[PDB]
Design a protein around this motif. Structure first.
Motif, mmCIF file in Angstrom:
data_model
loop_
_atom_site.group_PDB
_atom_site.id
_atom_site.type_symbol
_atom_site.label_atom_id
_atom_site.label_comp_id
_atom_site.label_asym_id
_atom_site.label_seq_id
_atom_site.Cartn_x
_atom_site.Cartn_y
_atom_site.Cartn_z
ATOM 1 N N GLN A 117 -43.748 38.983 -35.936
ATOM 2 C CA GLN A 117 -44.155 37.886 -36.807
ATOM 3 C C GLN A 117 -43.502 38.040 -38.164
ATOM 4 O OE1 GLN A 117 -47.806 36.426 -38.078
ATOM 5 N NE2 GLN A 117 -48.449 35.526 -36.124
ATOM 6 N N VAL A 118 -43.537 39.257 -38.691
ATOM 7 C CA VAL A 118 -42.935 39.546 -39.978
ATOM 8 C C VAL A 118 -41.488 39.307 -39.858
ATOM 9 C CG1 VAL A 118 -42.780 41.223 -41.786
ATOM 10 C CG2 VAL A 118 -44.659 41.355 -40.263
ATOM 11 N N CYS A 119 -40.840 39.737 -38.807
ATOM 12 C CA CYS A 119 -39.448 39.548 -38.563
ATOM 13 C C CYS A 119 -39.166 38.049 -38.477
ATOM 14 C CB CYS A 119 -38.962 40.218 -37.317
ATOM 15 S SG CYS A 119 -37.949 41.674 -37.524
ATOM 16 N N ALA A 120 -40.006 37.338 -37.789
ATOM 17 C CA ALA A 120 -39.874 35.899 -37.612
ATOM 18 C C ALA A 120 -39.904 35.200 -38.953
ATOM 19 C CB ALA A 120 -40.920 35.333 -36.762
ATOM 20 N N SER A 121 -40.812 35.640 -39.816
ATOM 21 C CA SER A 121 -40.936 35.066 -41.143
ATOM 22 C C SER A 121 -39.812 35.562 -42.053
ATOM 23 C CB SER A 121 -42.294 35.419 -41.747
ATOM 24 O OG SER A 121 -43.264 34.426 -41.444
ATOM 25 N N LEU A 122 -39.060 36.551 -41.580
ATOM 26 C CA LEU A 122 -37.959 37.113 -42.347
ATOM 27 C C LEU A 122 -36.652 36.409 -41.998
ATOM 28 C CD1 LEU A 122 -39.645 39.967 -43.176
ATOM 29 C CD2 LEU A 122 -37.262 40.698 -43.356
ATOM 30 N N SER A 123 -36.525 35.994 -40.745
ATOM 31 C CA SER A 123 -35.320 35.303 -40.287
ATOM 32 C C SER A 123 -35.569 33.808 -40.104
ATOM 33 C CB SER A 123 -34.826 35.918 -38.977
ATOM 34 O OG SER A 123 -34.865 37.334 -39.026
ATOM 35 N N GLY A 124 -36.845 33.422 -40.058
ATOM 36 C CA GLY A 124 -37.221 32.085 -39.923
ATOM 37 C C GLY A 124 -37.049 31.603 -38.495
ATOM 38 N N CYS A 125 -36.944 32.545 -37.557
ATOM 39 C CA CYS A 125 -36.779 32.193 -36.158
ATOM 40 C C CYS A 125 -38.104 31.919 -35.525
ATOM 41 C CB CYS A 125 -36.063 33.313 -35.408
ATOM 42 S SG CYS A 125 -34.616 34.000 -36.290
ATOM 43 N N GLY A 156 -29.225 35.166 -38.354
ATOM 44 C CA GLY A 156 -30.653 35.383 -38.279
ATOM 45 C C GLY A 156 -30.971 36.655 -37.594
ATOM 46 N N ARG A 157 -30.241 37.018 -36.565
ATOM 47 C CA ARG A 157 -30.419 38.203 -35.815
ATOM 48 C C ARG A 157 -30.246 39.370 -36.768
ATOM 49 N NH1 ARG A 157 -28.482 39.303 -30.913
ATOM 50 N NH2 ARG A 157 -29.043 37.145 -30.365
ATOM 51 N N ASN A 158 -29.466 39.152 -37.824
ATOM 52 C CA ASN A 158 -29.230 40.172 -38.826
ATOM 53 C C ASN A 158 -30.525 40.481 -39.563
ATOM 54 O OD1 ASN A 158 -27.435 41.506 -41.241
ATOM 55 N ND2 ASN A 158 -26.199 41.088 -39.421
ATOM 56 N N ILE A 159 -31.162 39.429 -40.072
ATOM 57 C CA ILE A 159 -32.426 39.577 -40.779
ATOM 58 C C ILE A 159 -33.465 40.219 -39.876
ATOM 59 C CG2 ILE A 159 -34.184 38.434 -42.014
ATOM 60 C CD1 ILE A 159 -31.927 36.042 -42.038
ATOM 61 N N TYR A 160 -33.575 39.694 -38.659
ATOM 62 C CA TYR A 160 -34.519 40.222 -37.688
ATOM 63 C C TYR A 160 -34.281 41.715 -37.494
ATOM 64 C CZ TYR A 160 -37.964 38.396 -34.556
ATOM 65 O OH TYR A 160 -39.157 38.039 -33.972
ATOM 66 N N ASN A 161 -33.004 42.093 -37.469
ATOM 67 C CA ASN A 161 -32.626 43.487 -37.289
ATOM 68 C C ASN A 161 -32.975 44.305 -38.523
ATOM 69 O OD1 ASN A 161 -30.807 45.271 -35.321
ATOM 70 N ND2 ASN A 161 -30.667 43.132 -34.668
ATOM 71 N N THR A 162 -32.627 43.798 -39.706
ATOM 72 C CA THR A 162 -32.929 44.499 -40.945
ATOM 73 C C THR A 162 -34.419 44.791 -41.036
ATOM 74 O OG1 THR A 162 -31.540 42.692 -41.777
ATOM 75 C CG2 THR A 162 -31.872 44.506 -43.261
ATOM 76 N N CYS A 163 -35.218 43.866 -40.514
ATOM 77 C CA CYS A 163 -36.661 44.001 -40.519
ATOM 78 C C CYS A 163 -37.109 44.962 -39.417
ATOM 79 C CB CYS A 163 -37.258 42.660 -40.299
ATOM 80 S SG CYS A 163 -38.682 42.597 -39.168
ATOM 81 N N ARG A 164 -36.782 44.626 -38.174
ATOM 82 C CA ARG A 164 -37.127 45.452 -37.066
ATOM 83 C C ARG A 164 -36.726 46.906 -37.288
ATOM 84 N NH1 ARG A 164 -37.879 46.020 -31.014
ATOM 85 N NH2 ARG A 164 -36.089 44.747 -30.352
#
Length: 46
Positions: free
Chosen positions: A24-32, A9-17
């Motif tokens: 929020q977008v990151c959260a909705s991207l990683s589902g965290c 998940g940290r990966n998705i959050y990172n890809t987004c960030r």
């Protein structure tokens, strides 16, 4: 911190960030879960 399912998940959050997103977008991207403190609920604090 955030409540992610796993290190993945940290990966998705990172890809987004790093991609140009936000929290929020990151959260909705990683589902965290976005916590407003140093704690986390029973939502997999990974």
């Amino acid at each position: 911190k955030s409540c992610c399912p796993n290190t993945t998940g940290r990966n998705i959050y990172n890809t987004c960030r790093f991609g140009g997103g936000s929290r929020q977008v990151c959260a909705s991207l990683s589902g965290c879960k976005i916590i407003s403190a140093s704690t986390c609920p029973s939502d997999y604090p990974k």
